[PDB]
Amino acid sequence: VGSLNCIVAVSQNMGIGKNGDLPWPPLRNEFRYFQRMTTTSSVEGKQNLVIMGKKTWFSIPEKNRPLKGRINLVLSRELKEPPQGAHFLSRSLDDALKLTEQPELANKVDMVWIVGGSSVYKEAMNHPGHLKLFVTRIMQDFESDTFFPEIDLEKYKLLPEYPGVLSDVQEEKGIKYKFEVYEKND
Numbered sequence: 380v381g382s383l384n385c386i387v388a389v390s391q392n393m394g395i396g397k398n399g400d401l402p403w404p405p406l407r408n409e410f411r412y413f414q415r416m417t418t419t420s421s422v423e424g425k426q427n428l429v430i431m432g433k434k435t436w437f438s439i440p441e442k443n444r445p446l447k448g449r450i451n452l453v454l455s456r457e458l459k460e461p462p463q464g465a466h467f468l469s470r471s472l473d474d475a476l477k478l479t480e481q482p483e484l485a486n487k488v489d490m491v492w493i494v495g496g497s498s499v500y501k502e503a504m505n506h507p508g509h510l511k512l513f514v515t516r517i518m519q520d521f522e523s524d525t526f527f528p529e530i531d532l533e534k535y536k537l538l539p540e541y542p543g544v545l546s547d548v549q550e551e552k553g554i555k556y557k558f559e560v561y562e563k564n565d
């Protein structure tokens with residue numbers, strides 16, 4: 380299995396959710412970015428693995444679960460079997476990561492993407508090792524009931540550019556935003 384990555388879209392007030400939906404109106408190209416980044420394998424014959432919490436899983440429109448072209452894994456201590464549509468279920472992020480060493484996932488998996496929510500991000504960000512954070516900074520405040528944990532700027536470095544990612548300001552539906560990539564090593 381390849382590298383470990385987080386990807387998130389965050390409002391200025393650090394919001395990522397609201398009533399089980401995105402805090403902002405649908406941003407078509409932010410979504411395409413998310414889709415292409417998590418779906419694109421760098422290795423032929425392999426798929427990427429996306430890891431999400433239970434609320435993130437159920438906040439996805441039923442018609443689009445599981446996330447297409449990716450191995451979906453859900454984190455929960457409460458579910459006893461993967462929800463309808465899902466392949467895998469782990470108790471925690473670390474169980475999930477160790478699960479990628481097993482034959483049935485190794486060989487099969489290229490990159491690992493953490494796609495939400497708040498608690499899963501927390502765990503991932505503090506996980507030891509090489510980690511990349513793909514952060515979309517939505518440049519305005521939205522009312523939110525879930526939040527993205529602050530990035531420890533002592534561990535993480537912000538890259539000026541990342542290959543295949545535009546650095547300049549984006550805008551859809553009146554809303555400006557920017558694609559950022561952070562890196563650390565332990």
Ligand SMILES: NC(=O)C1=CN([C@@H]2O[C@H](COP(=O)(O)OP(=O)(O)OC[C@H]3O[C@@H](n4cnc5c(N)ncnc54)[C@H](OP(=O)(O)O)[C@@H]3O)[C@@H](O)[C@H]2O)C=CC1
Pocket residue numbers: 386387388389395396397398399400401431432433434435436438454455456457458470471472494495496497498499502525
């Ligand atoms: N804009 C973005 O980039 C993102 C937006 N979102 C938004 O965020 C909101 C949901 O995210 P969140 O609120 O954080 O809910 P989560 O996706 O974190 O799932 C929360 C539930 O899943 C289980 N869970 C979560 N983390 C773990 C863990 N580390 N180990 C075990 N079980 C875990 C728990 O249920 P149990 O008791 O079963 O363990 C927890 O109550 C939604 O509104 C969604 O739209 C989602 C992802 C990112």
Ligand SMILES: CCc1nc(N)nc(N)c1C#C[C@H](C)c1cc(OC)cc(-c2ccc(C(=O)O)cc2)c1
Pocket residue numbers: 386387388399400401409410413435438439440443493494495515
């Ligand atoms: C596109 C939003 C986004 N951007 C970035 N930069 N990082 C992320 N992690 C997510 C995210 C997300 C979660 C998985 C999410 C939440 C959600 O709340 C309604 C909806 C979706 C979602 C998934 C798939 C489709 C689809 O295929 O049509 C639509 C909405 C997906």
Ligand SMILES: [Cl-]
Pocket residue numbers: 411415
């Ligand atoms: Cl596309």
